Amino acid sequence: GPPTSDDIFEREYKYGAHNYHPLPVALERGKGIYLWDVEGRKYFDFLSSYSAVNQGHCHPKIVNALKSQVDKLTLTSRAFYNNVLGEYEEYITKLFNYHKVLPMNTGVEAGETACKLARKWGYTVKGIQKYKAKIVFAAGNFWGRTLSAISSSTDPTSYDGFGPFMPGFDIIPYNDLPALERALQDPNVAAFMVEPIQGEAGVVVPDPGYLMGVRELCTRHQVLFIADEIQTGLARTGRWLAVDYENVRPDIVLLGKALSGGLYPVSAVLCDDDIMLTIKPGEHGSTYGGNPLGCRVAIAALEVLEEENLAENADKLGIILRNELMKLPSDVVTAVRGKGLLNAIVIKETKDWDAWKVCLRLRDNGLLAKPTHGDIIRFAPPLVIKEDELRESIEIINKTILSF
Amino acid sequence: GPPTSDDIFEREYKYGAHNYHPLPVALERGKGIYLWDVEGRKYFDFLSSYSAVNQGHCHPKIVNALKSQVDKLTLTSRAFYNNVLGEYEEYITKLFNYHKVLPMNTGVEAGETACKLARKWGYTVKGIQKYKAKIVFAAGNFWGRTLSAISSSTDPTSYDGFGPFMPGFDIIPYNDLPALERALQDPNVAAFMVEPIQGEAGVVVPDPGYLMGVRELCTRHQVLFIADEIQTGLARTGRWLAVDYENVRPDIVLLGKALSGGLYPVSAVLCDDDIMLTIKPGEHGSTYGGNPLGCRVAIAALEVLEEENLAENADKLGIILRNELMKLPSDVVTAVRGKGLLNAIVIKETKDWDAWKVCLRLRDNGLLAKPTHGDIIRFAPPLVIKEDELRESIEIINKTILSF
Numbered sequence A, B: 001g002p003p004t005s006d007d008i009f010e011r012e013y014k015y016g017a018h019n020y021h022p023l024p025v026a027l028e029r030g031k032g033i034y035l036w037d038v039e040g041r042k043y044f045d046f047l048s049s050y051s052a053v054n055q056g057h058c059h060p061k062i063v064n065a066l067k068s069q070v071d072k073l074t075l076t077s078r079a080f081y082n083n084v085l086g087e088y089e090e091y092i093t094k095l096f097n098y099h100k101v102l103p104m105n106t107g108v109e110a111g112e113t114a115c116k117l118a119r120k121w122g123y124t125v126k127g128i129q130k131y132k133a134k135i136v137f138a139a140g141n142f143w144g145r146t147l148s149a150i151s152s153s154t155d156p157t158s159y160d161g162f163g164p165f166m167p168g169f170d171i172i173p174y175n176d177l178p179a180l181e182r183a184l185q186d187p188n189v190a191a192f193m194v195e196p197i198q199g200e201a202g203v204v205v206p207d208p209g210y211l212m213g214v215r216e217l218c219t220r221h222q223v224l225f226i227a228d229e230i231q232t233g234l235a236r237t238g239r240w241l242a243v244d245y246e247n248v249r250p251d252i253v254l255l256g257k258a259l260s261g262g263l264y265p266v267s268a269v270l271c272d273d274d275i276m277l278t279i280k281p282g283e284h285g286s287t288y289g290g291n292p293l294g295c296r297v298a299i300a301a302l303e304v305l306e307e308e309n310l311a312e313n314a315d316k317l318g319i320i321l322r323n324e325l326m327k328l329p330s331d332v333v334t335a336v337r338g339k340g341l342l343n344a345i346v347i348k349e350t351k352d353w354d355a356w357k358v359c360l361r362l363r364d365n366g367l368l369a370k371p372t373h374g375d376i377i378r379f380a381p382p383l384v385i386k387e388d389e390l391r392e393s394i395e396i397i398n399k400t401i402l403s404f
């Protein structure tokens, strides 16, 4: 017969690396806001694969683009041109109003690309001596698992045991304009990379005016503002980009995750010519970056977010979600935070009761969510969810929280 | 009407980064050994997207796996289990006889993973003090474009303008056992990473006995042998792994590219428990690593290489290819090298005549190949090619080389 859930956990234990400890649920099917496990149980997805399935699981329009293009051509490499990449490049640069895009595959590769752009612009345009360029990051950041990405982390689970670390990366507190102003006094700083809302730090929303103040200070001191929108971008917070809430234009914008609707790893680095063209032919890229299959998928994924007005839906339904979550007793849920459909609750963790136990019981009651920190639970369902579906989910959350 | 080739080049010039200078040909369809451009011209593919389409373009079995799984589920993230990943993990670990695999997406991420494994094993098993671990690489190496990967490169096009660089990376000559023996005297060395045949250095095949000597020296000095088989693995050289030619077992094996038949970025890191399990839950991973769509594709891609005996075909036809290429006059083609269907010629470059011009004319005559170094041309067609097709391709190469 087909493997049970326990079989599935045990087989991965034997033959796969132990780099994750997932919540014990074994899915085999996803459609829209729902997931089904191998026993046939149905769940609400309140993680959305960290924003990658904003459009819902297996969105038919995005599937159709994949199935149409896989019959024509999937990979030429960049040794030649394929016919899809320029159509995608025109579409996304016009959509976000930047001169150019550099295509990559995973979110961390977009971050690496942005660090390379910042350094090469710092040396060739700003006039920093080679190799004294610095990049500033905010404590709590997470942008992936390469040696460079963990070198900017303050999370020991990211960096401990994996050094020595990349030089030239400085760290300041998040949501702290005086600290950024102090860091940018060094003319060897080339850029500041920052998430408009910190995802893995626990959905940390900075104070109103932070993003405008970051833009003002970067401009004043001739520093590039890199906005990592790999989780916050593409409608998840209720705008096309979370920086749109303060009408702020970063110098470099990073996209990923929902760029493909979860059907393909596609990421993107957006900026104008004065930054982009510091990288010359032969100096950067990726085997799969800009391949025609990912590009057809990304065009469709972007079209879905536009045609279905998913940013408006995320905004309106996020307000319902936070308002209803705030009714839970303060002695058990100590904070509700978020924008759009990127939200989190904080739990009054005890000796025995923690975020992991809440998420186990949420799973028992038909809802899938992921803990972090032991007292933080993310709530981020796909943006195609409807109000009726949202309210049923909240009832699952209430039932679970109040069952303890 | 539909864009012409020139239209396609111009649109990418306007809206995409200038990080590549591709050969001027604009493809829209691929099937098996062939590619078609937007004018309907048919070409032999003699690049195979740097080994990623070993199985030929759009292999029907691999397409079928993609189309079947995209209807069920494509991405849960590793916050939960999907049902496909363990089936893939069992298959590939049994196929290559290692305890475990760690799934990632791109080749450079597999390399980053291996560096993290080597460092964490060096600290926790070998007893190196944090953070003094070193990794040795061979001059000429290429394993991608992250800040760490360019820090081990000796190619200025990879690293110039992008420092400062990752510490702890030492470089020795390729194909040089005395130099490796000298480097491994430092007990803070944790690993040696090496390609069994250097791809982007120009298909540099080391001398017989090199890989055995590397294995012997690594074992003697308690150093991990990391074999980067992202281009050489998966039948391209006429064995499952290029290290099979000397019956050598690395400690860590890196796979990528052909792992998906070009339909999806899938990469893999293979090693035994004493190395793999130095990474604990929460310390490494990737959003898309091990997603169920890539895994179904990778299972099918691996099955194709086995069922169709593509390593045997690559071996037998590689010998024909090198033998026929060696008939070209020595004054124009100064070297022929390779194993299996990973081969290159070296050209007697002049003031006016170079590898780029040869490849332009090869394209005119129906064959697509890529230059490197100005005097090196790669010849690497998909492994499903037949002898009759191979001989027609050689006739295109002869016609072109002898037309100058």
Ligand SMILES: Cc1ncc(COP(=O)(O)O)c(CNc2cc(F)cc(C(=O)O)c2)c1O
Residues within 6 Å of the ligand: A078, A079, A284, A285, A286, A287, A288, B050, B106, B107, B108, B109, B111, B142, B143, B144, B145, B195, B199, B200, B228, B229, B230, B231, B256
């Ligand atoms: C031996 C070995 N190991 C790892 C990697 C990284 O694989 P990946 O690209 O998935 O990160 C590569 C990449 N090969 C390659 C060769 C080339 F001529 C151009 C490109 C390009 O980027 O356009 C890439 C590799 O050759």
Ligand SMILES: Cc1ncc(COP(=O)(O)O)c(CNc2cc(F)cc(C(=O)O)c2)c1O
Residues within 6 Å of the ligand: A050, A106, A107, A108, A109, A111, A142, A143, A144, A145, A195, A199, A200, A228, A229, A230, A231, A256, B078, B079, B284, B285, B286, B287, B288
């Ligand atoms: C803001 C931001 N920027 C870049 C990246 C890198 O994206 P990528 O994974 O494609 O390289 C991420 C990754 N998010 C994330 C969150 C999480 F809880 C687990 C994982 C995991 O790896 O399992 C990944 C990111 O949150």
